[PDB]
Specification:
alpha/beta; D-Maltodextrin-Binding Protein, domain 2; six-stranded mixed β-sheet; four-stranded mixed β-sheet; 17 helices; 16% strand; globular; binds a molecule of 4 linked components (GLC-GLC-GLC-GLC); membrane; transmembrane transporter activity; Bact_solute-bd_prot1; SBP
């Protein structure tokens, strides 16, 4: 008769997701979806505990960079059969990189829900007040550093820039200097290359040296997007997932393709919905995953709410996103895809990220240096992954 499934997720706060659930329930009168939301910072720890303790959600959200951990643990249902029998589902209409993110050992273990990237988001009022020209798509690091220096006004608690100094940010920033985290087959790390020391130093000196970016102490108890909303950051490197937050920013703002150094490199992220291997309700969970992936009404809701980008590439579905404002320069989101760098795909990503993030924080707090942080991170990766 009636089936009630659980869906565990992070990427929605609840307007858009609630409307998608309502539409799903209308179109699938025998299936009720009970949503549990966890903040991104705690989601994966919480999810793993739920699963390992024997009460996995029927369906749950995964990001690109945690997918392999789950796929390799065996907690996801193989969706091969479900997809074969979903006769009208046509994955050739989806973004291929986003769809492929949820494949493991040649099998689809998740349905792609959304994809996204990071841009430079800038406060035009601050730029105009200082007489600084806006970011361009052909800036290099030195143009943003010079802009950031002229836009910092220490007595008024205004910083020129803010960018995460984390493993997730660093695989991109390293690539902007021709560096990388792993070799092609994931058997060695080159995280401590000289170009990577320069790349990390570019980030950490903004906090510790030129003081154009707020430090951990300055951000204590808050997040950079909160300082940005408070008029205190001229340039913020963050995702398109914050465009909804920023609609009521009390200043004019716009976006630009991020600057590189030896080359451009931009983030590419994707979320997918997996079905628990142990669920008794896999058909219903799959129908919800499939809806979220490819249903046109879901895609239109997503677009209307600026909630990342839908998996579908259809131009009529995407047009309202290009026409929506703020920000005006919506084309920067799509221009950035030319320079994308995919997340490394390794089962220990979150664990190695935690260690590296602690090392990077120590540089920002004046307890370490970029070279020591990268040496320590190389050692920890080698031990964790057994590299020869
Ligand atoms: O749960 C909603 C939303 O939370 C997070 O967004 C806020 C977060 O953004 C910036 O940090 C991110 C960092 O968390 C990491 O993000 C990768 C992740 O981004 C999206 O998920 C966001 C969270 O980031 C989530 O939807 C995307 O949907 C997901 O697929 C990706 O895995 O890494 C990026 C790059 O370094 C970073 O921008 C911001 O710095 C931070 O302060 C803010 O709290």
């Amino acid at each position: 008769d009636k089936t009630e499934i659980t869906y565990y997720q992070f990427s929605a706060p609840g307007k858009a997701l609630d409307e998608m659930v309502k539409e799903f329930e209308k179109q699938n009168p025998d299936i009720k979806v009970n949503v549990q939301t966890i903040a991104f910072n705690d989601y994966f720890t919480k999810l793993q505990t739920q699963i390992a303790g024997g009460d996995a959600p029927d369906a749950f959200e995964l990001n690109y960079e945690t997918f392999m951990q789950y796929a390799e643990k065996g907690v996801l249902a193989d969706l091969t059969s479900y997809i074969e029998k979903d006769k009208d589902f046509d994955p050739s209409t989806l973004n291929k990189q986003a769809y492929d993110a949820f494949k493991y050992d040649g099998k689809q273990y998740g349905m792609v829900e959304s994809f996204s990237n990071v841009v430079t988001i800038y406060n035009k009022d601050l730029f105009d007040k200082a007489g600084v020209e806006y970011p361009t798509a052909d800036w290099t690091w030195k143009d943003e550093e010079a802009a950031a220096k002229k836009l910092t006004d220490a007595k008024n608690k205004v910083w020129g820039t803010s960018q995460p100094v984390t493993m997730n940010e660093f695989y991109k920033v390293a690539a902007q200097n021709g560096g990388s985290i792993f070799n092609e087959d994931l058997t060695e790390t080159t995280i401590n290359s000289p170009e990577n020391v320069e790349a990390l130093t570019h980030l950490t000196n903004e906090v510790t040296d030129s003081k154009v970016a707020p430090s951990p102490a300055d951000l204590s108890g808050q997040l950079p997007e909160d300082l940005f909303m408070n008029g205190q950051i001229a340039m913020l490197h963050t995702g398109i997932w914050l465009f909804d937050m920023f609609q009521d920013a009390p200043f004019k703002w716009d976006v630009q393709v991020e600057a590189g150094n030896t080359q451009k490199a931009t983030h590419f992220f994707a979320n997918g919905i997996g079905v628990s291997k142990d669920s008794d309700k896999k058909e219903a969970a799959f129908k919800f995953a499939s809806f979220m992936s490819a249903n046109e009404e879901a895609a239109k809701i997503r677009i209307d709410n600026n909630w990342e980008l839908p998996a579908t590439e259809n131009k009529e579905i995407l047009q309202p996103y290009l026409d929506a404002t703020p920000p005006d320069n919506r084309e920067a989101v799509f221009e950035s895809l030319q320079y994308m760098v995919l997340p490394p795909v390794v089962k220990d990503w979150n664990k190695i990220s935690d260690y590296t993030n602690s090392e990077f924080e120590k540089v920002l707090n004046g307890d370490s240096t970029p070279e020591k942080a990268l040496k320590n991170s190389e050692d920890n990766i080698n031990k964790t992954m057994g590299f020869k």
